[PDB]
Design a protein around this ligand. Structure first.
Ligand SMILES: [Mg+2]
Ligand SMILES: [Mg+2]
Ligand SMILES: [Mg+2]
Ligand SMILES: [Mg+2]
Ligand SMILES: [Mg+2]
Ligand SMILES: [Mg+2]
Ligand SMILES: [Mg+2]
Ligand SMILES: [Mg+2]
Ligand SMILES: [Mg+2]
Ligand SMILES: [Mg+2]
Ligand SMILES: [Mg+2]
Ligand SMILES: [Mg+2]
Ligand SMILES: [Mg+2]
Ligand SMILES: [Mg+2]
Ligand SMILES: [Mg+2]
Ligand SMILES: [Mg+2]
Ligand SMILES: [Mg+2]
Ligand SMILES: [Mg+2]
Ligand SMILES: [Mg+2]
Ligand SMILES: [Mg+2]
Ligand SMILES: [Mg+2]
Ligand SMILES: [Mg+2]
Ligand SMILES: [Mg+2]
Ligand SMILES: [Mg+2]
Ligand SMILES: [Mg+2]
Ligand SMILES: [Mg+2]
Ligand SMILES: [Mg+2]
Ligand SMILES: [Mg+2]
Ligand SMILES: [Mg+2]
Ligand SMILES: [Mg+2]
Ligand SMILES: [Mg+2]
Ligand SMILES: [Mg+2]
Lengths: 51, 206
RNA sequence: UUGACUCUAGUCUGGCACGGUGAAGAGACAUGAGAAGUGUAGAAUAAGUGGGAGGCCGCCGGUGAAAUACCACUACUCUGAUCGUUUUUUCACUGACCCGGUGAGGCGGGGGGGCGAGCCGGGCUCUCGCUUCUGGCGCCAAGCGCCCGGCCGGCCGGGCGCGACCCGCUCCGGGGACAGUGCCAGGUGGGGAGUUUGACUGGGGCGGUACACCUGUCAAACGGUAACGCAGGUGUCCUAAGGCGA
RNA sequence: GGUGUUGACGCGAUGUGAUUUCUGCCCAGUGCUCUGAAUGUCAAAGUGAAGAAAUUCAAUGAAGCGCGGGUAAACGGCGGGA
RNA sequence: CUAACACGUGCGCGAGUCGGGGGCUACGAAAGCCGCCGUGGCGCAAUGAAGGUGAAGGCCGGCGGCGCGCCGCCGGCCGAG
RNA sequence: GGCGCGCCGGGCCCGGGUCUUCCCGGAGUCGGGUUGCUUGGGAAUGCAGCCCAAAGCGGGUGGUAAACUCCAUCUAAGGCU
RNA sequence: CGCGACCUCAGAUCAGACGUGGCGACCCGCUGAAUUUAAGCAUAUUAGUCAGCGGAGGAAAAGAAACUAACCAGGAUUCCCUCAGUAACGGCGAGUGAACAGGGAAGAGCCCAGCGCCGAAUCCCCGCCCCGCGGCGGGGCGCGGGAAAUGUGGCGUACGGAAG
């Protein structure tokens, strides 16, 4: 579910990714926290691809 | 974003100067790409930042002073502009738009904006160019230095931004402090936080 | 009992999970490369934005405009194609799962050996692997080869391998990510359950409403007054058919 | 698990009731069955959009209903006036 | 018979009242006592859905406000139909 | 039988304050959706089945669902008394 | 081919133990009605009740906060008075219906896994000697066997803790 969420974040569908995580995780606060840690993981992937 | 990434980015460019070793004035530049801000909708952003860095400093100023301005502005070697010169180039308006081509940003005193809106103010605001006010402190020492680099984060219909900060030989800590305050006020001027920007990229003019 | 009311085991169908493996077909995308970025004024085919002051040996001005033009990497859109993310359809795979058979008895490759086909004794491709005139018998190894023990080349007693090929990862087959189960969802559901099936009345039922109201009579000159007494009416209609004035 | 130590000359569910002679008409109704593609109808889940979210809206759309064939040795039915 | 309520009557105290629960000291598992054990119940206040508010007034002296004779605010007097 | 006294043998050879440096937590569980039962618990108090299924300045509670934001309060999914 | 380790899994009338069943007033876990009330009846009510099933003890269960609160704040559980027939639920009909705070009975707190550091520093069993033996225990000796590194013991547990 979080691989598909990071796919939606690479496409940058943030509202769809947040609704996807809040359906398949539970509360909206947990959805926000997991969305921002997946965005952090994806930024670290972009830095790894950069340098 | 964290801090060590921009530390390593500025370190990488300050030792990667040897990629070019320019024939020009050596300086870097901030550029911003962001993800889904719609252009046709309202609540666009148009915000000046106050910056005590002056990171570019090669900058050309023209001030428009009232009384108590003349020989002191000419002794700090800033051109005094007068009502006779405003009517001199208000009889035809076209040469001061090339003065927006020579000079970037002006400065004004406090009374002249009844003389200005006759024809030439709305005629020559068509460059992004209106001269900046002073206050009743009546000082030009360092007030011109901080009213330059009041950086306009201006919204356009295009989804891209570029910020004019940084040269190669200022101090490292003051430069990372500069772009620290730059990117945090830019995120705070955006409609939402760090998700709203798609890329932070710091690389240089060449 | 059913066309009553409310539901029910069962059954049909959909979704989710168990539930995986490849190859094609349609994409939607991300990504690398590639080229238009043709209003007018303007040496002009100016997409936008900010930095920008000299390489190489256009330009910083100026010209017109809403808006420039060395150089750098910025993000936008449009069109062809490479690559890897997912959805979908078909064809396969088997390993979960199911079915049958047996005392789970020779499965799959390969090696060896006979019968034909065609080339110059040869190989390749293929096939076969020993039972059909008879209401018989059929096992517990003969033969071979190599070791070994006891007694005196002779006697007696043993062991191992070919005979009965080798190697393997599911016992063989047959289905297969669907049957199926677990949980929701809709349909069907007197097979089964629980219950209901008004009142008044010259017995009850059928009829009628005398069950909520209105007029005249009853009703005996205040009011009141009964029957399934009498003659009748109502569940509406009106932007005026309400309110004034003439 | 029974039929089943079974396999359409069987098992299971019906009606009618030996033999002879026949077995007429009707599929409109109620059933049963066949087909899934005109407009329909259609739950949960999935999808998309709006919104700060709960939420709302939209599209897609299984069976069954509808619609369309078959069937009376299925339940049944089979006129009137001059 | 137990519980709850209502009214009437008897009794104690009375804007209070009650220890029923706890504690301290044969009949007696009774009885007495607690008071800085009245916690609490009921009563002493009502109304409102709720925010909430929450049960006399008059006269005198002073400082049309005008085409607050009313009186706004301060000092005195009478005072609870 | 218990409380007292003494001997032999055996076990432990234990602590408190200050400073400095380290370290710290229970997962098919919390939670969400749906369904059923229970509850005074009412946009679901608790329990369970199925599906989804975490996080670590986190998580739960804060009696009306939800989003933003300060607070307050505890530390679940281990055990004894 | 054989031998030897470990892992999974069998067979023992092996050595030593343990569980089974009964009573069941009180207690714990599950299952669970209908009479009855609603002047009918279907939601409710009877009612988490009767019946059924499993499991104990001298008491069981609970129990040291993922608590109550919103105050100047209390502080495990259990029981009594009260909160209160209140808040609330309910064809909002009949009916149902707790808790907090307060006063009392009682009063007690603790231990792991984890994070670690100490040469497994830990434990069980058999043989022999001494003592005690009708609650098989205390000490010594075995180059006796075994468990355990897939983790025993010591310190340490949210009130912080460890080491120097
Ligand atoms: Mg019906
Ligand atoms: Mg039925
Ligand atoms: Mg019936
Ligand atoms: Mg009757
Ligand atoms: Mg009359
Ligand atoms: Mg009369
Ligand atoms: Mg028949
Ligand atoms: Mg028909
Ligand atoms: Mg009385
Ligand atoms: Mg039940
Ligand atoms: Mg129950
Ligand atoms: Mg109930
Ligand atoms: Mg609230
Ligand atoms: Mg809040
Ligand atoms: Mg704990
Ligand atoms: Mg606990
Ligand atoms: Mg034995
Ligand atoms: Mg027993
Ligand atoms: Mg009744
Ligand atoms: Mg009755
Ligand atoms: Mg009855
Ligand atoms: Mg009940
Ligand atoms: Mg019982
Ligand atoms: Mg006992
Ligand atoms: Mg106990
Ligand atoms: Mg316990
Ligand atoms: Mg309590
Ligand atoms: Mg009371
Ligand atoms: Mg009850
Ligand atoms: Mg209490
Ligand atoms: Mg340990
Ligand atoms: Mg604790």
């Amino acid at each position: 579910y979080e691989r598909r969420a990071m796919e939606l974040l690479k496409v940058s569908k943030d509202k769809r990714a947040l609704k996807f995580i809040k359906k398949r995780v539970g509360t909206h606060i947990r959805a926000k926290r997991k969305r921002e840690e997946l965005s952090s993981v994806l930024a670290a992937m972009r830095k790894a691809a950069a340098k | 974003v964290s801090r060590d990434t921009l530390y390593e980015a500025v370190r990488e460019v300050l030792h990667g100067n040897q990629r070019k070793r320019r024939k020009f004035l050596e300086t870097v530049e901030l550029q911003i790409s962001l993800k889904n801000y719609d252009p046709q909708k309202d609540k666009r952003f148009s915000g000046t930042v106050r910056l005590k860095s002056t990171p570019r400093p090669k900058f050309s100023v023209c001030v428009l002073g009232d009384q108590q301005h003349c020989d002191e502005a000419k002794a700090v070697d800033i051109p005094h502009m007068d009502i006779e010169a405003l009517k001199k180039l208000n009889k035809n308006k076209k040469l001061v738009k090339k003065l927006a081509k020579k000079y970037d940003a002006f400065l004004a005193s406090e009374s002249l904006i009844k003389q200005i809106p006759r024809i030439l103010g709305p005629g020559l605001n068509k460059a992004g160019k209106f001269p900046s006010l002073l206050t009743h402190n009546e000082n030009m020492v360092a007030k011109v230095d901080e009213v330059k680099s009041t950086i306009k984060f201006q919204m356009k219909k295009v989804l891209c931004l570029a910020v004019a900060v940084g040269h190669v030989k200022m101090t490292d800590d003051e430069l990372v402090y500069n772009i620290h305050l730059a990117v945090n006020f830019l995120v705070s001027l955006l409609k939402k936080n760090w998700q709203n920007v798609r890329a932070l990229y710091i690389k240089s003019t060449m």
